Design a protein around this ligand. Sequence first.
Ligand code: ZNH
Ligand code: ZNH
Lengths: 108, 294
Amino acid sequence: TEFKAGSAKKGATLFKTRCLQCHTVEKGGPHKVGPNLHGIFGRHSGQAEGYSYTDANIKKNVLWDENNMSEYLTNPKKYIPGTKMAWGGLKKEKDRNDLITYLKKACE
Amino acid sequence: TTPLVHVASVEKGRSYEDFQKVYNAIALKLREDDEYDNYIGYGPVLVRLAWHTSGTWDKHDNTGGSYGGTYRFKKEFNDPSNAGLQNGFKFLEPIHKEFPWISSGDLFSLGGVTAVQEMQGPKIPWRCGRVDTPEDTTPDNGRLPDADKDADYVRTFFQRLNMNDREVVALMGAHALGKTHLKNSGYEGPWGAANNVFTNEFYLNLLNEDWKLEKNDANNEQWDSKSGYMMLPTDYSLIQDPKYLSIVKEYANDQDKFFKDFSKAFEKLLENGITFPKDAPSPFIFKTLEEQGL
Ligand code: ZNH
Ligand code: ZNH
């Protein structure tokens, strides 16, 4: 596709250092600062039950595919204005590919 | 004889655009070397640098402070409470070679200002004019604060920096950034989850989490939470003291109030002990990388 595909093991260290403080990826996993991301691909934004999202994340209503997700992790506040995901952003494309390929694996 | 008067002298023929290019150099390098400290980046160590070199000020005889740029000297560089800031100085030196005209004080304080703005924080006004001073003006070790203390200590310590109750609570909110390293200070773990984005989480975590006093692997006593976070004895002293508690709740509810309060307090911290003439330019507000389209 437009996004390539990288290393799944490099993307594991990227998640563990940069996403795991707030997110879990396994089946039936608990909601921490952020929601459980299992089954995030092919699902619409703001649909994980049991978690309280902002009105902006639900109103955006985009089906999470590998491309719009790469756009989101670049700059969260520019993609979904008003989101409470306190995150800087993955500015390097290699790091975006590496993490999306690991997330693809970890979340079904 | 009165204290020493440190008059701000702007570096020969330099203006806003020359300093914007130094800011831009620190900001891009911050974006480039984002691998540092398990991906936290160099953002937090730089604000800590800007504070530890300004934090040696003593209002009574005007010794210490950011002006001198005295952190480049071995006595202040090897101060036990300055452990870990070598990494911050090492990040700053290649850009000191690219811009040899800028004084050390101006560079360390600029790095802090750059670090906070780039981490989505408030825009903090910065003034130039600090001048390098000799090896003999270098402050003796022991002027920085200890972590294993109470509210009475914090209040008396910050009086030396001319900071009131509101200023200290705001400044302490910078602890929303980074972590404590056992190898450096004897304490371990983060204060929050967003360790490289400037937010008011420090205050929300202080009163919304369940804290238990435990012992770490350096035998020091720190407050831990079930969610994996930590607080220093000086940090939790902010909810034990009734006067500090009120301001903490105010910052936990209103981030914009924290943002505006941090900026005036931090600018005051960086500028402490410096006398700016009437002819000197009005403070610089720099354009972030995101504001330049990057
Ligand atoms: C790490 C690199 C991270 C991601 C991968 C990632 C992804 C992610 C997605 C796809 C969502 C949308 C969820 C939905 O079902 O619509 C989302 C949401 C929220 N997140 Zn994150 N995220 C990564 C990291 C972080 C970090 C470091 C934090 C912790 C401070 C964080 C937090 C949250 C959060 C509170 C979310 C809800 C957003 C909303 O407005 O409701 N994320 N993430
Ligand atoms: C009382 C008082 C006080 C005290 C005791 C302290 C202490 C501290 C300690 C111990 C540490 C750790 C180190 C290591 O590495 O290990 C830190 C860090 C710190 N810090 Zn902080 N602080 C303080 C204040 C402060 C202020 C005021 C500021 C600013 C504004 C700061 C900023 C800081 C930072 C940002 C950090 C992080 C860094 C990193 O991570 O690198 N800080 N501290």
